[PDB]
Coordinates of C-alpha atoms in Angstrom, one line a residue:
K6 CA 88.9 244.0 188.1
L7 CA 87.9 241.6 185.3
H8 CA 90.6 239.6 183.5
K9 CA 90.8 237.7 180.2
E10 CA 92.0 234.1 180.2
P11 CA 92.9 232.0 177.1
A12 CA 90.7 229.2 175.9
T13 CA 90.5 226.9 172.9
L14 CA 87.5 226.3 170.6
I15 CA 85.9 222.9 170.7
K16 CA 82.7 223.6 168.9
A17 CA 80.2 226.4 168.4
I18 CA 76.8 225.2 169.4
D19 CA 74.3 228.0 168.8
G20 CA 74.3 231.8 168.5
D21 CA 74.6 232.2 172.3
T22 CA 76.5 229.0 173.3
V23 CA 80.0 227.7 172.5
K24 CA 82.0 224.8 173.9
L25 CA 85.5 225.6 174.8
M26 CA 88.5 223.9 176.4
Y27 CA 89.1 226.0 179.5
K28 CA 91.9 225.3 181.9
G29 CA 92.2 221.9 180.3
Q30 CA 88.5 220.9 180.6
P31 CA 85.7 220.9 178.1
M32 CA 83.0 223.4 179.2
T33 CA 79.9 224.9 177.6
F34 CA 79.8 228.7 177.8
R35 CA 76.7 230.8 177.6
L36 CA 77.4 234.3 176.3
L37 CA 76.6 236.9 179.1
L38 CA 74.0 239.6 178.6
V39 CA 72.7 238.7 175.2
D40 CA 69.7 236.8 173.9
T41 CA 70.0 235.5 170.3
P42 CA 67.2 233.9 168.3
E43 CA 68.1 230.2 168.7
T44 CA 68.3 227.2 166.5
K45 CA 67.7 224.9 169.5
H46 CA 65.0 226.9 171.4
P47 CA 63.4 224.9 174.3
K48 CA 59.9 225.2 172.8
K49 CA 60.2 226.7 169.3
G50 CA 63.3 225.2 167.8
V51 CA 64.4 227.3 164.8
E52 CA 63.4 231.0 165.3
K53 CA 63.8 233.8 162.7
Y54 CA 67.5 235.0 162.5
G55 CA 68.6 232.0 164.5
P56 CA 70.6 230.3 161.7
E57 CA 72.1 233.7 161.0
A58 CA 73.1 234.5 164.6
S59 CA 74.4 230.9 164.9
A60 CA 76.5 231.2 161.7
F61 CA 77.8 234.6 162.8
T62 CA 79.1 233.3 166.1
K63 CA 80.5 230.1 164.6
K64 CA 82.5 232.0 161.9
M65 CA 83.8 234.5 164.4
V66 CA 85.1 231.9 166.8
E67 CA 86.3 229.4 164.1
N68 CA 88.4 232.0 162.2
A69 CA 90.0 233.4 165.3
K70 CA 93.7 233.1 166.2
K71 CA 93.1 233.6 169.9
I72 CA 89.9 233.0 172.0
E73 CA 89.8 234.6 175.5
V74 CA 87.0 234.3 178.1
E75 CA 86.2 237.0 180.6
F76 CA 84.1 236.1 183.7
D77 CA 82.0 238.9 185.4
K78 CA 82.0 239.8 189.1
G79 CA 79.1 237.5 190.1
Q80 CA 78.3 233.8 189.6
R81 CA 80.4 232.1 186.9
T82 CA 78.1 229.2 186.0
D83 CA 74.3 229.0 185.5
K84 CA 71.9 226.3 186.7
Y85 CA 72.7 224.2 183.7
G86 CA 76.4 224.1 184.5
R87 CA 77.4 226.5 181.7
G88 CA 80.1 229.1 182.2
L89 CA 78.8 232.7 182.1
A90 CA 81.3 234.9 180.3
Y91 CA 82.2 237.5 177.8
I92 CA 84.0 235.7 174.9
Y93 CA 86.7 237.5 172.8
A94 CA 87.8 236.5 169.3
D95 CA 91.2 238.2 168.5
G96 CA 90.4 241.0 170.9
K97 CA 86.8 241.6 169.7
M98 CA 84.0 240.8 172.0
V99 CA 81.6 238.2 170.4
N100 CA 78.7 239.4 172.6
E101 CA 79.0 242.9 171.5
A102 CA 79.5 242.0 167.8
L103 CA 76.2 240.1 167.8
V104 CA 74.4 243.0 169.3
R105 CA 76.0 245.6 167.0
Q106 CA 74.8 243.6 164.0
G107 CA 71.2 243.3 165.1
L108 CA 71.6 239.5 165.7
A109 CA 71.0 239.6 169.5
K110 CA 69.2 241.7 172.0
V111 CA 70.6 242.8 175.4
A112 CA 69.1 240.2 177.8
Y113 CA 67.4 240.8 181.2
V114 CA 70.3 241.9 183.5
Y115 CA 71.1 240.2 186.8
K116 CA 73.5 242.1 189.1
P117 CA 76.3 241.9 189.7
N118 CA 77.0 240.2 186.3
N119 CA 76.4 243.5 184.5
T120 CA 79.9 245.0 183.9
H121 CA 79.5 245.5 180.2
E122 CA 75.8 246.3 180.2
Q123 CA 75.8 249.9 179.2
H124 CA 78.4 249.3 176.5
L125 CA 76.1 246.6 175.0
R126 CA 73.1 248.8 175.3
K127 CA 74.8 251.5 173.3
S128 CA 75.6 249.0 170.6
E129 CA 72.0 247.8 170.6
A130 CA 70.7 251.3 170.2
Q131 CA 72.9 251.8 167.2
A132 CA 71.7 248.5 165.6
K133 CA 68.1 249.5 166.1
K134 CA 68.8 253.0 164.6
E135 CA 70.4 251.4 161.6
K136 CA 67.5 248.9 161.5
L137 CA 69.7 245.9 161.1
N138 CA 68.5 242.3 161.0
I139 CA 66.2 241.8 164.0
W140 CA 65.5 245.4 163.9
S141 CA 64.6 245.5 160.2

Protein backbone atom coordinates (compact mmCIF):
# COMPACT_ATOMS: atom_id res chain seq x y z
CA LYS A 1 0.00 0.00 0.00
CA LEU A 2 1.55 3.28 -1.09
CA HIS A 3 1.72 6.15 1.40
CA LYS A 4 2.37 9.89 1.10
CA GLU A 5 5.11 11.52 3.17
CA PRO A 6 5.64 15.26 3.68
CA ALA A 7 8.50 17.12 2.04
CA THR A 8 9.64 20.73 1.60
CA LEU A 9 10.43 22.48 -1.63
CA ILE A 10 14.03 23.45 -2.14
CA LYS A 11 14.03 24.29 -5.84
CA ALA A 12 12.28 23.24 -9.01
CA ILE A 13 14.91 22.22 -11.54
CA ASP A 14 13.10 21.25 -14.73
CA GLY A 15 9.70 19.98 -15.87
CA ASP A 16 10.45 16.50 -14.61
CA THR A 17 12.83 17.18 -11.67
CA VAL A 18 12.50 18.96 -8.33
CA LYS A 19 14.84 19.21 -5.35
CA LEU A 20 13.10 18.62 -2.02
CA MET A 21 14.05 18.36 1.63
CA TYR A 22 12.98 14.83 2.49
CA LYS A 23 13.41 13.43 6.00
CA GLY A 24 15.78 16.30 6.71
CA GLN A 25 17.99 15.78 3.65
CA PRO A 26 18.25 17.60 0.32
CA MET A 27 17.34 15.16 -2.46
CA THR A 28 16.70 15.44 -6.21
CA PHE A 29 13.40 13.80 -7.25
CA ARG A 30 12.61 12.57 -10.75
CA LEU A 31 8.85 12.44 -11.39
CA LEU A 32 7.76 8.83 -12.02
CA LEU A 33 6.14 7.71 -15.25
CA VAL A 34 6.35 10.94 -17.20
CA ASP A 35 8.60 12.39 -19.84
CA THR A 36 8.53 16.18 -20.24
CA PRO A 37 10.29 18.17 -22.94
CA GLU A 38 13.36 19.36 -21.04
CA THR A 39 15.27 22.60 -20.67
CA LYS A 40 18.42 20.66 -19.79
CA HIS A 41 18.25 17.73 -22.21
CA PRO A 42 21.46 15.66 -22.29
CA LYS A 43 22.02 16.29 -26.00
CA LYS A 44 19.46 18.87 -27.17
CA GLY A 45 19.20 21.38 -24.33
CA VAL A 46 15.99 23.39 -24.81
CA GLU A 47 13.26 21.42 -26.56
CA LYS A 48 9.82 22.64 -27.65
CA TYR A 49 7.38 23.02 -24.72
CA GLY A 50 10.31 22.59 -22.30
CA PRO A 51 10.15 26.11 -20.83
CA GLU A 52 6.40 25.67 -20.57
CA ALA A 53 6.54 22.29 -18.82
CA SER A 54 9.24 23.66 -16.54
CA ALA A 55 7.23 26.76 -15.62
CA PHE A 56 4.15 24.63 -14.98
CA THR A 57 5.94 22.38 -12.50
CA LYS A 58 7.69 25.27 -10.79
CA LYS A 59 4.50 27.27 -10.30
CA MET A 60 2.63 24.28 -9.06
CA VAL A 61 5.17 23.37 -6.41
CA GLU A 62 6.09 26.92 -5.47
CA ASN A 63 2.54 27.96 -4.76
CA ALA A 64 1.66 24.87 -2.74
CA LYS A 65 0.88 24.81 0.98
CA LYS A 66 1.82 21.16 1.35
CA ILE A 67 4.13 18.99 -0.80
CA GLU A 68 3.94 15.19 -0.36
CA VAL A 69 6.04 12.46 -2.00
CA GLU A 70 4.75 8.99 -2.77
CA PHE A 71 7.23 6.22 -3.62
CA ASP A 72 6.07 3.27 -5.75
CA LYS A 73 6.47 -0.45 -4.95
CA GLY A 74 9.87 -0.89 -6.72
CA GLN A 75 13.25 0.85 -6.62
CA ARG A 76 13.08 4.27 -4.94
CA THR A 77 16.18 5.82 -6.60
CA ASP A 78 17.55 5.71 -10.17
CA LYS A 79 21.15 5.31 -11.28
CA TYR A 80 21.78 9.06 -10.81
CA GLY A 81 20.80 9.01 -7.17
CA ARG A 82 17.44 10.71 -7.78
CA GLY A 83 14.31 9.70 -5.81
CA LEU A 84 11.63 8.12 -8.01
CA ALA A 85 8.25 9.30 -6.85
CA TYR A 86 4.81 10.70 -7.41
CA ILE A 87 4.80 14.28 -6.13
CA TYR A 88 1.60 15.93 -4.76
CA ALA A 89 0.99 19.72 -4.42
CA ASP A 90 -1.94 20.36 -2.06
CA GLY A 91 -3.38 16.93 -2.81
CA LYS A 92 -3.01 17.20 -6.63
CA MET A 93 -0.51 14.90 -8.35
CA VAL A 94 2.05 16.95 -10.31
CA ASN A 95 2.77 14.01 -12.59
CA GLU A 96 -0.84 13.72 -13.67
CA ALA A 97 -1.36 17.48 -13.98
CA LEU A 98 1.48 17.70 -16.48
CA VAL A 99 0.07 14.85 -18.56
CA ARG A 100 -3.49 16.21 -18.37
CA GLN A 101 -2.28 19.53 -19.85
CA GLY A 102 -0.37 17.98 -22.73
CA LEU A 103 2.97 19.03 -21.21
CA ALA A 104 4.33 15.48 -20.73
CA LYS A 105 3.91 12.01 -22.20
CA VAL A 106 3.55 8.82 -20.22
CA ALA A 107 7.09 7.35 -20.14
CA TYR A 108 8.26 3.81 -20.87
CA VAL A 109 7.04 1.83 -17.85
CA TYR A 110 9.31 -0.37 -15.72
CA LYS A 111 7.44 -2.80 -13.44
CA PRO A 112 6.83 -2.80 -10.60
CA ASN A 113 6.99 1.00 -10.49
CA ASN A 114 3.72 1.26 -12.39
CA THR A 115 1.00 1.77 -9.79
CA HIS A 116 -0.52 4.92 -11.36
CA GLU A 117 0.19 3.95 -14.96
CA GLN A 118 -3.37 3.43 -16.24
CA HIS A 119 -4.57 6.59 -14.47
CA LEU A 120 -1.87 8.63 -16.23
CA ARG A 121 -2.62 6.95 -19.54
CA LYS A 122 -6.26 7.93 -19.23
CA SER A 123 -5.25 11.55 -18.69
CA GLU A 124 -2.87 11.41 -21.61
CA ALA A 125 -5.60 10.13 -23.90
CA GLN A 126 -7.78 13.09 -22.86
CA ALA A 127 -5.04 15.60 -23.54
CA LYS A 128 -4.43 14.09 -26.95
CA LYS A 129 -8.16 14.19 -27.70
CA GLU A 130 -8.32 17.87 -26.65
CA LYS A 131 -5.14 18.44 -28.72
CA LEU A 132 -3.38 20.34 -25.93
CA ASN A 133 0.19 21.68 -26.19
CA ILE A 134 2.40 18.74 -27.20
CA TRP A 135 -0.59 17.27 -28.95
CA SER A 136 -1.52 20.49 -30.79
